[PDB]
C-alpha cells in the first residue's frame, strides 16, 4: 500500500522536512484509490504543492516534481511616490513570505494585491511588472517596478441649492481651494479618497447655525470617480424655516445638583436652533457636575422638531451610576527616573473623588517638565467593584544633555567659541544641573547652577549658582572698564498662585575693574564715596564686594510656550544692596510680552512686547556704571548697533595715555584736541524704556509639511535710554542726558526658524528716527546656543 | 557543509575576542532548517540578541518553546532562564556603583522576572535549578517591597493620611518576610493619630516592642 | 560561546533574608499572589552553561 | 506664604444619604447607595470608615469621619459620627 | 604698502569664499538631502606674507531639494551666506559683512563622475579705518559673483574606502575698490584647484563613522586683479576631517584645514561640534 | 502617463475643403466634458455656450446672429452662467437645452427671449431627445423625467437600481413605436413605455459579475437606435446586445466595449471605443473585422458618414477621413489648432463640428 518511490530528485535542496515529512504517505497511508484530498491536497498543498496531476502507482509514476527557486528580500526599484515602509504587508498577508519558494503559479496572488494597496488614489489597473527572473538560483531577486496609471487632477466643483446664501462663500468655507494668491503657497488641485468625510461635515454644521433643522440630502451623494478625468459633484441641499430654540427644562434628578445646571443651560429668548451650540452644551456635565466625583457620565438629548409654531425644545436625561471613587495610582515606565520625581504635578491623589479639572491639570503639569512628550490618561476600571477606579499615566523617558563646541554668529557679539558643557537633569532625582562655559569675543562667562525645584512640600525651589564673567567691555562697542567679576548667589522661590513665581535670595558679588578711561560719566560715581583716582595714567584698580538681596516676580500665563499665540509674559527682576556691603544702590527691570490674536486659527497675532527698567543710588551715592541698562541690537530695538542707544561719553583732557598713541578715543593728545572733546560711545543709563509692536502674519514660502518652525514676523520697535543724575547746568554746549529724549524707532521683517545648529533668530530692519551718535545696522541674525 | 562548523565547535570564543564565531551560527539555518546536524544551530536566535546587551530585543523569542515543543524534558529547565533576561532590565549600570537605590523605580521588569519563578515552584515540586533562585528571589522580594514604602513615605510628606493607610495595607497583605514592613509600621500610627478615628489606633499604637533594630 | 551567559552578570549578589513576626496581635498577610512569593520553595542545584535551545 | 493645592482625603459624603441608615444593616445595602469605603481595617473584624477630609488653600483642614463596625453576619452598625474635628 | 596690503584686501575676501566639496553644500554623499535642515558655521584665521592677519567667521544656511532621475541625481536648492572678516594687519581694521545669496545643482552619475555647478552672488560693505595714517572712513559697496564648476570622479578601491579626485574651475566678475584713496576694472578671477581626496569609512550594527582626508592643489591660470595687477599663486590645501553619526550622537570629529606655502595661507579652520544626548 | 501620443502616418490628398468660416461664438468652451452639439434646421445653424448666450448662424457664411440672455440668475452687480451641458436639439421650432444647475430651458426660434423653465430634482446631462410631445431628460441619478412641449404639467419619474462607482449620465434615450428604450446607467436595458413607467425589466449586460477589482464598468453614454425591429445597445467591455423589441431574455456579447456614440449604416455598423480605433461590426458572424489601431489614444470622437467617409476629431484639431469599408484611406487637413472634443453630427450635407475654443466649421468635402 505504501509506495517506496514517493521521494524524487532535487526535492531535498531547500527544504528536507517541510517538503518531505509534511505528508501522510509514510506511516499511516490508508487510502489508495481515491487519494484526492488526503496526501497531496490536505496538508502538503499548503507547503509547496500547487500542481494538478494526481499521484498514481509506480508503474505509471512520471510525477518528478522539481523544487522551485526561493525568493529573497525584493528591493522595489523605481519607487514612484511610494515608500518601503508601507510596501511590506503585501507579501505575507496575500502572497508568499520569505523562506518558502515561489511555485510560478501563485504569482497571481502576489500580483493581485499590489494594485489593491493603492486605494488612496484609486488605481484599479496598475502597471506592475510581471516578468521572469533571468538568474536561475542562489537567492534570486524579482523585478517589481511600480508606475502610475492615471493622473490626480480635478476638473471643477459646483454646488446647487443656494436658497438663502450665495455660491462663492461655500468654497472658501470648505477645505477645497483651486486658486493660489500672491501671499500663500496652497491652492493646488489635489484629490484624496479620505478627505470626503472632512468637507461634508462642515457643510451640515454651517446651515445648522441658521435654524434649518430639516437639513438633509435628497438621497444622493458624490459619485465615486477613481480619477478618470470625468468627475461630477452634485450636492442638492434642502433648507427649511429659521426656528427658535426655547428653554431647556430639567427632567429627572441630575445627581442632586440640577439647580446649578439651569443657569448655564438657559439661553436668552429669541435664539434659533443653533448647530454649534447643541454640541457645546452636551459637554456641560464636566465643568460643574463631573468635577465632584463623576468619571463616566451619560447624558442624552433628543430634538423635538415642532413645525407648527416653529418652536424647538430639548429634554435632558441622566444615566449616572455610583459615586465613582478613586483607588491607588499605578506608574509604569519609570526606567531612568524615579517614582517620587513624578507624583507631585498631579493635583489628584489616592483616596479621593475624581474631578474633571483634577486630571487635565496634572496632565499639563507633567508634560511641561520636559522629561517626556508622550503623556496619556488610562482610566481603567476595576472589574471586581463598580467603584474605586484606577488611573495610569504614560511616559516616554527621553534623553537630555549637550556638550558641543558650536561656533555662534558673527554680527552682534562676534565669533563665539561656546564650549557649553550642559550637564542636564540628573539620574532621576530631579535636579536641574547646568554648566555653560561659553567664550564670546568680549566675555568669558562660565556658570555652575544646581537647582532643586522642590526643596519643601508644595512648590518651594532652592538653587545656587556660581559665575565668573571676566568680560572686556572694549569689544562690546563701549569705551573702557575691562571688568573681572565672580560671585555666588542662591534663590528661594515662593509661588503664590498657579501663574506667579515670586522669588527671593541673597548673593555675593565681587568686582575688579581696571584700565578705566577718565570720563565724566563714570568718575562721578568714583567721586561719590571713594577716593580720587589717578588721572595721570591707566590701570585704576577698584575692588568691590557686595552682598545684595535679589527679588523677582514672573507671570507666565501662556498656552504653547515655544511659539506663543495667546497670553502674557510679565517678568520682574530687582536687587538692592544690604547695609554692610561696599556701595548702596538698587535697580529694577520689568519685561512684558503680550500675545493678542485677531483670528480663530491662531495664525494672526499682535505682539506688544515692551521693556522697562530703572536704577538709582540709595542717598548720597550713585548707581555703578557696570550695572547700567543698554538698548542695542536684536534684543530691544532691532535696527541699530549693539549697545548704542543712550548717553554718550565725554572724556577728560589729560595726558593719561601709557605709550602715547594717536587718538584712542581720548582728547588732549598729539592731535591737538585740548578743549571741548566728546565722542559717540554709549555708556548706558539709569533708566530704559523700550516698546515694540509686532505682527506674526505667516510666510508664503513653506506650506508643504511643516509650519510650526518658520515664523516670519513684521515689527515696529521703539526705545530710549537716559540718565537721571546728569548735570544740566554745570556743563554747557553739550546734549542734555537728563530727560527722556527723542524716541529711537525702527521697523522691518523678522524670522524665527529653528535650525539644527541652534535656533536662528533673523531680523532685518531699517531705522526711522536715527540721530547723531546712534550707529545703525541692517542684518542682525542670531544662531548658536 | 555540516562538518565545517562541528570541526570548530570546540573552538569557541575563549581564544578569539569578539567576532570570530558569531557569523558562523547563521550558516546552516539559511540553507535547511530540518537537518540532523543543523538543528542545534538554528534555534539560537535568543543569544545573538542577548550577547550584545540588547535586552528588549531578545524578549521577542521567549515564547518560542511553549508552542512548538511542549513535550521536551527541559520545560522545567527553561523556566529559570527567563528571570535572567528580565532582571538585567530591572537594575541599570548607571546606578550600580554610584550608590543609588533602584527600589523606587518601575517594578514592571521585576514582575516579568517573577511570573516565571512563580510557575517554577508551583508547576513542579522537585525541579533541578531551584536553590539558585532562592538566593535570587530574595533580592526581588525586597526590591518591590520598598517601592510601595516610598509611596507611603511621600504621602506623609504631603499630609494625605487616607492615601498612606491604603498603601501600608497594600504592604500588609503580600509582604510577610521583607525589610520594608519594619519601617512601615510607624507610618500607620502617624496617620491614625492625625485623624479623628481612634477606635483601633490603640492596637497599632505600640511598634517598637522587642525588635530593637 | 554556545552554552554561556554574558552581558550584565551582576545579579549573582543579593541581600540576606530577614524574618519578622507580628507582636501587635493577629496581624497576618492573608491575600497573596500579586506581589508575594508562595509559601513553598522547592529544591534544586546550581550551575552554569544554560541550555538555551528551545 | 506658599499656596496649597486641593488635598482631598477619603470618599465623598452627602447629607441626604448619611441620615437614612439604621443599626443592624447588612453589608449589601450600605455598599450600594453610599458605595464601597476607601478604608479597609482587617484588624479582627471588618469595620468601615467613611471619612470626608478636605484641605483647600490657606483654610485649614476639615474632617467628618464615621465608625461603622461589623461582624461575621453584618450587624451592629452603630452610628458614631464626628462632624466637628478637634 | 598702499597697493600690497592696504588695497589688496579684496583678493583675500574672494579667497575666503571658495571651499571643498563637503563645505560649500554639506554632507551630500550617501545622505538624503530632502529637508533643508543644514547649517555650516565655520571660523578660522589666516596669515599672508608681510605681517598680514585675517579673522573670518563664514556661516552658511539654506534649503535643498531632492530630485531623482535615470541614474542622474539632481539636487537643487539655494542658500544664503554671511562672512565677517576681521582683517587687521598693522594699520587698518576690516569689519566687512559679506551678505549674499546663491543656488547650486548636482550631476551625480552612476560611477561617481559628478559635475557640481555652484553660482552665488555676495555684496560686502567695508568699514576700514586707517590707524596712524591720518585717514577716516572708506566704506565701499562693491559686489562679487561666483561661477564655479566642480568636476570630479570616484574610484571604488574598497567596499568601505573610496578614492576620489577633484578638478574645479571658479569664475568671477568682481570689480574691486572704486573709491580707493582710484578706480578699478572688471577683471575675472580664474582660481582653479586640482587634487585627489583620500577617503576612509567604517560602519557597524547601528553606528557609522567617516575618516576623510585631502591633498588638493590650487593652480590659477589668469590673475590680473588691479585697482598693480596680481601674480600667479601655487599652494596645497591639506584638509583632513572626521565625522560620525551614532544614534546617541550628531558629530564627533574635527574639520582641520591647513594651507601650504604661497601668497595667502589659511592657518586653521577647526569646526568641531561633538555633542551627546545622555 | 502610461503611453504617449502616436506619430502621424502617411496622408492621401484627394479632396481639399477651402471655405471654412470661423465664428468664435460664446466666451469659450474650456476643459469641460459636455454634450453641447450644434444643430442645423431650416438653414439655421444653432450654436450655444455654457455662459448663457446663444447665437444662431447660417450654412453659407454664418449671418443672422442674435444675442439673447437666458441664463443670468443675477441682477445685482453682474451676471452668472448656468453651465449648460444638455445639448442643442430642435423639435418643432422649440430648442430644449439642459444645464448642470438642475434647470431645463425651452429656447424659442422667433426671438429666443421667452423661455419657460421647470424645476427638476436631477441634473440635465444627457442629450434632450424629444418625441411624441415629450422631452426625455435622463439625469445622472438614473431618474427619467419627461417634459411636455407646451407647459410641462405632468412629470412622471421612474428610477432603476443604480449602484455607485459611476462616471457620467450622458446616455440619450430614444423611442421605438411608443416603447422608449433607455440606456441604463448600471449595465441594464430599459425598454419602457413613455406614459408612467410601470413595468421595469432589467438584464445585466456587462462583465461586472466575472471581474472583482474594477472601477468603472457599469456606465456608458451611448444611445440605442432601433432599425428593422432590432435594438442596438452597448456596454463597457461588452458588445452589441441586439434583442427584440418584445422584452426578450436571450442575450449575447462578443468583445471590445465602447464609450462613444455609433451610427448604423446598412450592414457595416461603425464602432469607436476607448482605444481610439474604428471597426465595422456586422449583425451576426463578425465578417471582415478590420482594425484601425494606428491612431490609438488620439481622443477620437463619434464618427459620421459625410459623403462616403468617416470624419473624426483629434486632440490637436486634425482631421481623419476614414473609409467606409476597410478604413485604409486616410485624409488629413488643417481647420483648427486647439483640439476636437465635441462629437460632430451630419445633417443636410453640412459637417457641423465644434472645437475646444468655441467655434463651428462647415467642412464640405
Curated annotation (Swiss-Prot), chain A:
Main location: membrane
GO cellular component term of the entry, any: cell outer membrane
Effect of residue 406 to P: Lethal, wild-type protein levels
Parts of the chain on the Periplasmic side: 1-401, 424-431, 453-460, 484-499, 555-567, 597-605, 696-709, 755
Gene3D superfamilies reported for this sequence: membrane protein fhac (3.10.20.310), membrane protein fhac: a member of the omp85/tpsb transporter family (2.40.160.50)
Domain POTRA, first and last residues per copy: 1-68, 69-149, 152-240, 243-321, 324-398
Protein's recorded name: Outer membrane protein assembly factor BamA
Disulfide bond found in the keyword field: no
Recorded domain comment: Contains 5 N-terminal periplasmic polypeptide transport-associated (POTRA) domains which interact with other subunits of the complex, may recruit substrates from the periplasm into the outer membrane and also act as a chaperone. The C-terminal region forms a discontinuous 16-stranded beta-barrel transmembrane region. The central pore is ellipsoid, and probably closed by extracellular loop 6, perhaps with the aid of other loops.
Traits of the deletion mutant: Deletion is lethal. Depletion results in the accumulation of incorrectly assembled outer membrane proteins, including TolC, OmpF, OmpC and OmpA. Decreased expression leads to decreased susceptibility to contact-dependent growth inhibition (CDI), and decreased expression of outer membrane proteins (including in this study LamB) as well as up-regulation of periplasmic protease DegP.
Family that this chain belongs to: Belongs to the BamA family.
Superkingdom of the organism of origin: Bacteria
Matches recorded under InterPro entries: Bac_surfAg_D15, BamA/TamA_POTRA, D15-like, OM_assembly_BamA, POTRA
UniProtKB/Swiss-Prot annotation, chain B:
Gene3D superfamilies, A to Z: Tetratricopeptide repeat domain (1.25.40.10)
GO-annotated biological processes: Gram-negative-bacterium-type cell outer membrane assembly; protein insertion into membrane
Entry keywords, A to Z: Cell outer membrane, Lipoprotein, Membrane, Palmitate, Signal
Subcellular location: Cell outer membrane
Any single GO CC term annotated in Swiss-Prot or TrEMBL for this entry: cell outer membrane
Membrane topology summary: Lipid-anchor
CDD domains cross-referenced by the UniProt entry: BamD
UniProt cross-references to Pfam families, sorted A to Z: YfiO (PF13525)
UniProt xrefs under PROSITE patterns: PROKAR_LIPOPROTEIN
Summary of the knockout phenotype: Depletion decreases the density of outer membrane proteins, but does not significantly affect transport of lipopolysaccharides to the outer membrane.
Domain notes: The N-terminal may interact with various proteins as a chaperone to assist in the folding and insertion of proteins into the outer membrane. The C-terminal region may serve as the link between BamA, BamC and BamE.
Purpose: Part of the outer membrane protein assembly complex (Bam), which is involved in assembly and insertion of beta-barrel proteins into the outer membrane. Constitutes, with BamA, the core component of the assembly machinery. Probably involved in transient protein interactions. Efficient substrate folding and insertion into the outer membrane requires all 5 subunits.
NCBIfam families, per database record: OM_YfiO, PRK10866.1
Family from the record: Belongs to the BamD family.
Protein name according to UniProt: Outer membrane protein assembly factor BamD
Organism whose genome encodes this protein: Escherichia coli (strain K12)
Swiss-Prot record, chain D:
Membrane-related topology note: Lipid-anchor
Effect of loss of the gene: Mutants show minor defects in the assembly of outer membrane proteins.
MF terms in GO: identical protein binding; protein-macromolecule adaptor activity
Primary location group: membrane
Keyword Secreted: no
Annotated GO CC locations: Bam protein complex; membrane
Subcellular location: Cell outer membrane
GO biological process, one term: protein insertion into membrane
Protein keywords: Cell outer membrane, Lipoprotein, Membrane, Palmitate, Signal
Family statement drawn from the similarity comment of this UniProt entry: Belongs to the BamE family.
Function: Part of the outer membrane protein assembly complex (Bam), which is involved in assembly and insertion of beta-barrel proteins into the outer membrane. Nonessential member of the complex that stabilizes the interaction between the essential proteins BamA and BamD. May modulate the conformation of BamA, likely through interactions with BamD. Efficient substrate folding and insertion into the outer membrane requires all 5 subunits.
Subunit structure: Part of the Bam complex, which is composed of the outer membrane protein BamA, and four lipoproteins BamB, BamC, BamD and BamE. Forms a subcomplex with BamC and BamD. Monomer in the periplasm, but is able to adopt a dimeric conformation in the cytoplasm. The Bam complex has the shape of a hat, with the BamA beta-barrel crown in the outer membrane and the periplasmic brim formed by the BamA POTRA domains and the 4 lipoproteins. The intact Bam complex can have 2 BamE subunits.
Curated annotation (Swiss-Prot), chain F:
Primary location recorded for the protein, binned into one broad class: membrane
Keyword Protease set for record: no
One Pfam family linked to the record: PQQ_2
Cellular component annotations (GO), alphabetically ordered: Bam protein complex; cell outer membrane; membrane
Xref: PROSITE patterns: PROKAR_LIPOPROTEIN
Example GO molecular function: identical protein binding
UniProt keywords, alphabetically: Cell outer membrane, Lipoprotein, Membrane, Palmitate, Signal
Topology within the bilayer: Lipid-anchor
Compartments it resides in: Cell outer membrane
Highest taxon above the source species: Bacteria
Claim: Membrane is one of the keywords in the record: yes
Transmembrane stretches, start-end: none
CDD domains assigned: PQQ_DH_like
Cystine pairings recorded for this chain: none
Free-text function comment from the UniProt entry: Part of the outer membrane protein assembly complex (Bam), which is involved in assembly and insertion of beta-barrel proteins into the outer membrane. Nonessential member of the complex, which may orient the flexible periplasmic domain of BamA for interaction with other Bam components, chaperones and nascent outer membrane proteins. Efficient substrate folding and insertion into the outer membrane requires all 5 subunits.
Summary of subunit composition and partner proteins: Part of the Bam complex, which is composed of the outer membrane protein BamA, and four lipoproteins BamB, BamC, BamD and BamE. Monomer. Interacts directly with BamA. The Bam complex has the shape of a hat, with the BamA beta-barrel crown in the outer membrane and the periplasmic brim formed by the BamA POTRA domains and the 4 lipoproteins.
Family statement: Belongs to the BamB family.
Protein name stated in the entry: Outer membrane protein assembly factor BamB
Gene behind the chain: bamB
